[PDB]
Symmetry: D2
């Protein structure tokens, strides 16, 4: 709000409103009231003294939270969970709110619901990007381009084939995100140290009633599975599995955008339009943010390593930051990446220019093989070809002119039984190998199947 | 081998890790596998109609272990190439196969596929080790399932848990590691034959435009390698995302192990539990030190994957020769040392009982107020009456450094008339542990044993 | 702040209003205007057609910022700096033609970051010194009070409370020195142009090489810096950010160490936080994040291509502010902790008493030899009385009774009864109290002098 | 070459990569030798203070003679006492005055500090040598115009010498950091089990002054100017942080330089030294790989010091043996390879000139309009004419993949007749370099040469 105070650039400038809502106070305190409703619903079903009038008024007061009252009662009573019990019970039921449960019933189950929801926003966005990159890869599947190893010219590839290297990495990320989201489990009702003591007390020693309660709220929260063993909170290892797959996504994006930045210099490919000089500013923002995601991994790792026994509260402040800032960063990244993918501009003639410069240095083997087939001796042909290439290399390096190796093998009499066959031995398409067929097979076997559920 | 004391010894090779994992990352295994990959290539190429004879095949199959490391290093100096040097040395012990070795292949066919074979082997040696650790902790967790111990939140006295339940926190964290390790081993895919830029250009020229034969070759060497699946899309090498996926689980494992051993170290101070053999928990401190390094190593493959330009840059080669090996050798040492810890953790039941009885009356107060309504007495007048006696009892403990005298105060107090006779039953340690004992039994049978079953051998 | 939107907890819950302001858009764009004024003033002196009316106009409108207009212009122009040049030129109609004259974007953007970095360090420095000041008082007060030393977190030769506090102080002192050096050696970017060659300023002064050097000197002195970079690309070297976040990350490691000890002492009931050690848990949590952040500028500086790549911007806008707001929060909480550390001597005594006999056995032997005793016929006589006591402590879970077993054996009769002068807790503390004395007088107080 | 069988894992940092000097610094031979040298200094200093010690010569002559089997046997039977016994066998005359009243960390921890300082002393001259070589190159190419790069897009011309200065300045800040950390490195001395000097206070019979004189004497004998007053068992693990922080900062600088060389290699502007036609910057690639590891190693000591409980805990021992040794072996290798790259950088002036002429015309438009106004032309007419001709040239480059013909278009247009004679001056590369050459001379004389003078 105020420009007098520091404002998170991930919150006020970079990320989408959708992701910002999930990590807001309004959504957190709404979920708190939502978890209290489910607790009361399941407790009434199991025989605890709860009247239907207490339930209906909690149901009609889910999105009616007084912040001015809650903020000052938190300053008055120190504890934040109990401060929200008072505020809910004021617009309500008061006697049955949070009965038996501890602070971490709302706080910790909210985090897993927030976590599951945030992953649910990233998935269709990642698929959307992949889909748009897939169309680009299919369109440019046969357009030959100079391949790079050590960032030096190497055996030709296609523009579509190069794109599939990016697509694959994102397809592993989609799969990883989906797995982690599906594997996410509910804490349930566990108590102060995970022994379920206070809940067992209310049900007066009934062990089956506690287990039924643990299955009831888990299904109301939309989780398939619920933890058996926990300390106070869910194991902090969960936060590692989630941030690992995001950091991996960060690495992928960084590689993709660095490729695009290098292609922008070669003037072979640029970012979509709204001038001669164009900076790839969106890819650079992406690289910047991806880096943050890779850094973020050390936070949950260090945390879980130093949790003592059932729970130490030195996870609280660190998780408030790293978890939201992981998803806000990933969110910005995917919005930007989606923007970049919508009509990447390719300049074919610039690509054709770079090929015809380096191509003759790679086609030398084809020439000799064509001399042998006619009747020329390999040994003698190798010595007479490894001499015109050193001349043509000198012109390029020492003098800074265009490549003229093809001309020199047209003005040499020794290479007379090849002059008619030269413009076929230099067809760029006959140097791309199985590149176009690799795209074909990859998109149908691996890419399209994964995109199928996300068709919308 | 244990080299001269004049040179630096890497402690992960001799000082710590098991000779098995050391061998998987050795030059012998590396170059035996190189020659194996050349044998599978020749066999499959002979199947596809290339001029290779049975005699040439038997020659390669016989000389697989016959490696001259001295000559290969000397030829590497001259030829300025590691692979083409080993092609020459293999051709020297195989004079008839010399012509067909590495036909159509590029450097990474042997270089990069060997690292995939190394990864899968290295994971398959870690799994049984991680499972034996889980098993012995599951033995321990069953024995001590109903042994009350003071629970710690904020490392401060809280409601009672059991020793078995505390062990299950450790068990679960290692159980998710087992699942993650398995999943990564199964997801590993063979690179196969791809050529210098992944376009299979060289092999397509060998079969002379025959696209079907090239894809046939790729499947053939993959099956011979024992891989269910191979990549369709690579540059020169398999995507360096695979390193991230592997080392992310080892780093995560390290975080769980570091937690387990920090917990054990703290218990050793409390005298509640100690390691097998004034004693120092050196082996838990050894585990912590190494787990830390295992967590640190994750930033390497992360950064490596982020700066790989196009189809490949060699700015990953040296880094991978360090991070991958060390991660597994570190991961190896940890689980060998952790296995020795889990085999016989010593519990001191009487020391645990002492700490419980000096903290229990402060959390048994609620049961008293509920118990006092049998007569009965008022809820609010009793809440303040027992509250102030705790203020006097906690003052002798902290401000004067003594023992808990709260029980002594209530027994002589005239106000607490009826409750006297049922106090020992009210302070029953088992009636504070909740469902801890039932949580232990269910966790082991529902989740632990089904996971450990495939490792009966 | 809005409840419907996410808010960075460091700005709305944790850090001080002082630190939050140094990283605000108000401070940022005011400094932009502050740097444009200096440039104009120096350009006038060097002979450019700028009137005092124009400078007077600029000096009057440093704080008069229209953010609404500045945001609308950036959407249109797709440029941060030019938008603010236009907005400043709107409330300064006469100076509009001379704002940002011959300058590049990074003259404001990059020099502002350096100004912000220096200012933020200048707020952390007094706060750190003040923490060290009160921890020094605590170290002097409890300098002689013996406490059980811990190696491997196991009872070892007893030290003193003040001595253990000095281990904390020494780490923080090193931080204070490292924060001072980084702030003092921090340099100004100055005027460098788009690629660091000063080509555009050279053209404005129509070739006059000396005038470009003077303009660089003048804006540096006006900014309050002692030194400027001679060599830069577009921006100051990103190595600078590494050095700053390195000292802060190291400070995080120190803070986490101090707060872990406090968290362990609270468990042992030997020391307490002023009120669960929740303040030390908040400190540990944030210190952890401060250590994480060092990897950002490291990766950022490693992949800077040539004269500059813009893949540093968004990351720095996150990692720099977050580091300082975190650091600020930590020190604030550490101040509160240091104001009210409560020691409980009696609990310390009790723990000492049940471990002192296990560490005093060597002095008993040394007092038995010259009293007429054998070196093995006494060592065995006491070591058996240590085996039975180790069972009472560990197998039975009771009190340590080696302080009881003296009358039991008639062998130790010459020892009756000059003790417990031999079991004096102060006689096992070594040079702990002298070491505290020297440390404060030679190393700590000289550092806290000019604060 | 060193020894090791191919049947076990041999760390490439020791056997394959680093130079023999650094390997010896972290070897067992140097570790145990320094132990005995520290034991000697202890006896000699205790002799000067009054303790019953006589001619010292025996320990002096038996420093090189170490039996590793005897030490390993006693290590299996009982490491410090295993070496007290081994050094107390081949020295029969003196065995009751070795390690007298000292703890396991007098040798083990002070050795760790003599190694660190030895390792830094090998690095310093090596880093100075690289700066010196690069500086020579920078002076030689200080007035050689090259294309400036921002966003890796064409920008205001700089010089080759100037770009080199950006690298030098990074390394110069590294040399400063290393000198400061090495000089401010303190000795642990004598402290005892928990750092109170109790064991020594007993054997000097309560003498305060004598304990403090022993601290100064072994500090002076070790080559240190200063000793710690306050330490626990070992020196504060903050020391590891500061050492590896600056090393991590060096790896970042090296990565930047070597990424630059690699990119220049693709532009064919600059190349690694000889000993064609395709050449790979494999040496710069090795450096980036190794520098990356060096940047990673920083979290090790960071995590270590943060979880040190009280006086000392030995969960640092295994981590420090790895991380410290690795960092200095990696730093050493990097600087050895970076010495190679510096030694005979190949520059291709004509390739550099070709790139400039392709990008300069677009940047030179301001000067052309200035020259046209200077002759009697209109500002608007010239700006519109130069606008239509620049967009025509941009199409030829982008859409057609041809050379930059902007100057040709100006040269054939009759409107530009007033400046046709001026064109070979208006587009002089040197006039676009700004003050680059002057910055090089000033930087080298005021910062580099003073900094290198002590290292001469």
């Amino acid at each position: 709000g105020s420009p007098d105070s520091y404002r998170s650039p991930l919150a006020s400038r970079y990320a989408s409103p959708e992701m910002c809502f999930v990590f807001s106070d309004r959504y957190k305190f709404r979920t708190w009231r939502q978890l209290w409703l489910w607790l009361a619903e399941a407790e009434q079903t199991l025989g605890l003294p709860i009247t239907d009038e207490q339930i209906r008024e909690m149901k009609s007061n889910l999105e009616n939270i007084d912040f001015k009252m809650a903020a000052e009662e938190e300053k008055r009573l120190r504890h934040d969970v109990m401060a929200h019990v008072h505020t809910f019970g004021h617009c309500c039921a008061a006697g049955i709110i949070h009965l038996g449960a501890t602070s971490c019933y709302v706080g910790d189950n909210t985090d897993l619901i927030i976590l599951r929801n945030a992953l649910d926003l990233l998935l269709p966005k990642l698929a959307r990007v992949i889909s748009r990159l897939a169309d680009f890869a299919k369109e440019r599947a046969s357009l030959p381009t100079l391949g790079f190893t050590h960032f030096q010219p190497a055996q030709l590839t296609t523009v579509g084939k190069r794109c599939c290297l990016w697509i694959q990495d994102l397809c592993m990320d989609l799969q990883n995100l989906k797995r982690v989201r599906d594997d996410l489990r509910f804490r349930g009702v566990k108590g102060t140290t995970g022994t379920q003591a206070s809940f067992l007390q209310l049900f007066e020693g009934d062990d089956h009633k506690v287990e039924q309660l643990d299955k009831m709220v888990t299904e109301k929260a939309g989780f398939k599975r619920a933890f058996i063993i926990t300390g106070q909170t869910y194991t902090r290892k969960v936060d590692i599995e989630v941030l690992s797959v995001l950091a991996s996504l960060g690495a992928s994006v960084h590689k993709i955008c660095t490729d695009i930045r290098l292609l922008a210099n070669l003037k072979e490919m640029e970012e979509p339009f709204e001038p001669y000089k164009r900076n790839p500013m969106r890819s650079e923002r992406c690289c910047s943010l991806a880096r943050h995601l890779m850094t973020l991994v050390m936070d949950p790792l260090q945390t879980a390593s130093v949790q003592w026994f059932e729970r130490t509260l030195d996870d609280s402040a660190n998780r408030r930051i790293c978890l939201a800032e992981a998803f806000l960063t990933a969110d910005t990244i995917l919005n930007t990446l989606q923007n970049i993918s919508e009509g990447l501009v390719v300049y074919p003639k610039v690509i054709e220019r770079r090929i015809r410069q380096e191509l003759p240095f790679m086609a030398t083997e084809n020439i000799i093989m064509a001399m042998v087939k006619a009747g020329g001796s390999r040994q003698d042909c190798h010595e007479k070809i490894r001499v015109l290439s050193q001349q043509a290399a000198s012109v390029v390096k020492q003098e800074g002119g265009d490549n003229d190796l093809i001309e020199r093998i047209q003005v040499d009499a020794y290479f007379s039984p090849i002059h008619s066959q030269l413009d076929h031995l230099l067809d760029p398409s006959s140097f791309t190998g199985r590149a176009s067929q690799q795209v074909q097979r990859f998109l149908e076997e691996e890419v399209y199947p994964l995109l199928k559920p996300y068709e919308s």
